[PDB]
Amino acid sequence: CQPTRFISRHNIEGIFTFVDHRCVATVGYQPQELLGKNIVEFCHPEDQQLLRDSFQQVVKLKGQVLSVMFRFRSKNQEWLWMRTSSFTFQNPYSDEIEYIICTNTNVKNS
Amino acid sequence: FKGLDSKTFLSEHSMDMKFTYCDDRITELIGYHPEELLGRSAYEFYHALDSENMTKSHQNLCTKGQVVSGQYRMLAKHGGYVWLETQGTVIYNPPQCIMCVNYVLS
Numbered sequence: 001c002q003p004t005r006f007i008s009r010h011n012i013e014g015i016f017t018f019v020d021h022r023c024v025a026t027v028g029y030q031p032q033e034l035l036g037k038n039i040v041e042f043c044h045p046e047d048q049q050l051l052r053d054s055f056q057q058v059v060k061l062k063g064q065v066l067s068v069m070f071r072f073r074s075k076n077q078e079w080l081w082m083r084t085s086s087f088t089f090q091n092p093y094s095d096e097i098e099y100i101i102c103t104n105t106n107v108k109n110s
Numbered sequence: 111f112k113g114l115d116s117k118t119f120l121s122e123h124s125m126d127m128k129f130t131y132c133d134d135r136i137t138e139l140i141g142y143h144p145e146e147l148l149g150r151s152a153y154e155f156y157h158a159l160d161s162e163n164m165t166k167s168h169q170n171l172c173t174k175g176q177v178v179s180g181q182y183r184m185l186a187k188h189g190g191y192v193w194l195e196t197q198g199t200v201i202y203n204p205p206q207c208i209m210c211v212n213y214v215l216s
């Protein structure tokens with residue numbers, strides 16, 4: 001079967017700056033219900049600090065992939081297991097601040 | 111003069127190089143609608159003279175997990191060719207797809 005997964009981009013704080021519309025089938029929100037908010041706001045409280053430290057590390061890892069598992073609160077207010085795979089991008093023609101590219105998949109915890 | 115940012119778009123691909131997703135931004139820059147790209151191999155879009163090099167970039171990507179394409183031409187929706195440079199990243203799960211960050215040079 002096709003996994004459900006959407007792409008997002010974030011600043012280094014965690015704030016959603018771009019959300020791919022496949023987010024509707026994955027977590028149930030419209031992209032504009034996510035844009036401008038921190039991904040940590042949709043995260044389970046036992047998982048928030050791991051996710052904040054993941055965002056902090058991914059920038060130190062030279063564009064390599066960092067992956068994290070956490071519980072995300074769907075528009076049903078249900079806790080979905082997400083595997084988020086992330087990496088920095090920084091256009092080497094510029095010295096603009098890197099931002100974080102994410103793929104986000106509902107996976108099984110088992 | 112468009113920005114570096116306004117000339118960057120993402121795409122996602124299955125392991126055979128077919129598009130599974132593209133930013134709407136590609137329309138403004140190259141003319142394609144993402145929905146017409148899905149299911150087509152990226153290979154269909156390379157200028158023949160960049161082809162063998164993109165086959166190599168793809169090989170470095172599958173084996174190393176990440177690659178910087180170096181300069182290539184993509185056929186534009188309404189004729190001619192745009193210059194791009196792409197950063198590819200393979201997302202492995204527990205290979206599941208390729209993420210591409212695409213920058214339009216020309």
Ligand SMILES: O[C@@H]1CCc2c(Oc3cc(F)cc(F)c3)ccc(C(F)(F)F)c21
Nearest residue numbers: 123127152155167168179184196198212
């Ligand atoms: O093989 C991967 C998988 C698909 C792809 C790639 O696709 C694109 C081709 C285009 F002509 C335009 C585009 F936005 C993406 C562009 C570059 C690469 C890369 F990584 F260089 F190899 C790859």
